[PDB]
Amino acid sequence: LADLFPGFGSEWINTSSGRIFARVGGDGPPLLLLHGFPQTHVMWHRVAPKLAERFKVIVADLPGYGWSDMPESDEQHTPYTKRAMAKQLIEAMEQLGHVHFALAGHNRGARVSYRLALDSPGRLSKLAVLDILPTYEYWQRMNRAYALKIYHWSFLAQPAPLPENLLGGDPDFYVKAKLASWTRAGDLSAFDPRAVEHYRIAFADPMRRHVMCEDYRAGAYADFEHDKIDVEAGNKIPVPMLALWGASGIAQSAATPLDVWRKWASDVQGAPIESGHFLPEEAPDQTAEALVRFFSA
Amino acid sequence: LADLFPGFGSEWINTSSGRIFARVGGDGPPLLLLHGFPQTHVMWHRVAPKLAERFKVIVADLPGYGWSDMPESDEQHTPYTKRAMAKQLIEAMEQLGHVHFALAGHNRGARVSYRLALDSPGRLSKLAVLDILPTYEYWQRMNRAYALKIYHWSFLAQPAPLPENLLGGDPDFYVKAKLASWTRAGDLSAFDPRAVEHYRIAFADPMRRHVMCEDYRAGAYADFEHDKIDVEAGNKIPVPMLALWGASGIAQSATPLDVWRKWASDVQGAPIESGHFLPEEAPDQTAEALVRFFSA
């Protein structure tokens, strides 16, 4: 497995729920980067160096993902709810002395990120979310067209062991197909092959795949309910916020992303990127420039 | 594989789209029985003897299922659309000299049946649909709760080869879990083990599994478009119709008779205490309901 972060250290950070693995590089204001599914921290490898020119950059594996420890789940999928993941990453940042930091997330990590902003806004100086809408908004849009396009939201949320059993037959095919199907190109050419191997290796482990399913089960249940409380209360994120999305990604598919996020946040700017879902890899230059400019201001 | 229709003959019926396998028994007015997913014609084995006391009973494998031939599909999943399947089964019935017949279907076969009634009503004396709503109504009801309860419609409709590759690793596990999941009790006790073996053997064939996925792709695309045309035009089935559903089945997740009254001008209906698989979970009540409907 390649080292894709020149000049970054490697740290295991202790928390009450298990270790968080992170690559750590740079100096200056702290910035945490959170990946999603079906990836690991390495999906930031093309934009993290540019950010580390200006920031101390912490590139973390989500709880249960990558090389982070896997806390034991329960019938309500608690440790893989975004509320719990955010609490665990808040603990990890406190181990480094960071109680007020910038945060960017993609896919599941962006769900941790906006849930963190809603629960604990004092932790965040600025927030960027990449190619997502809130979990509540995806479910409210779950008509025929969306049920077909993001079928995995219902499939991976089926009770164990149905998705685990299906994924175990040919996991390499599944992870590679999901990566490719959400790129503008439709193949793996937007990814560094060494990064794909990181994703393939993690996805090859049945315990890691079970975590992913627990994450999607939380996404169908507790995460949805948590979001629903905020919608009904009219709670908006007060943290200065950036919403990036791919012109052909998931978030734009049944909604207008900036219009949606303005319903969830009082200080949000946005921009489309010529890209599929995987902005930091398909469009590293535009993504890095947008993030550097946002987090510097 | 067991013979679950003692006394019934066996026919391989040529059509322009491929052979239809059927068991044939009884005597009287002709009655065609159509299974669905993930089953074969044998799921009628508990009700077919009683029906054969009153009707000439034709128990057919759907195009591409069981022992029927598997036409090559295309970009629109055409041979596995219910419109195409209905045309093919009309041809098969004509080979037996049946140009006007009674029809009962379950699951995918019930979808063939109501599409047949919409496209070619003159072919049917009476129609029964078991534990289904129209495909359009399933999709229109799509929301979070629906998507989580009946996920396989969107999963199996993903572009090839995604569901085929996932199903290929351990096919026995998936078909047995699907059968059990939709019964009242949630296990396999409602099924004759010899019938389960028929379903398992069919599902073990990758070509048969691809047909099933093409069927669900049709169900997400052309079948839905065909239904949408009819409901937006206000076209109703004029054939006298029976909707039977399981109190713990798939169709009721909606008020099925009220749904069907929007699609049919002469429909009656009743629930039965059962999961989805009415002819196996509740054979006596299903057989009686069908005998009384088709004999009236």
Ligand SMILES: [Cl-]
């Ligand atoms: Cl996501």
Ligand SMILES: [Cl-]
């Ligand atoms: Cl239905």
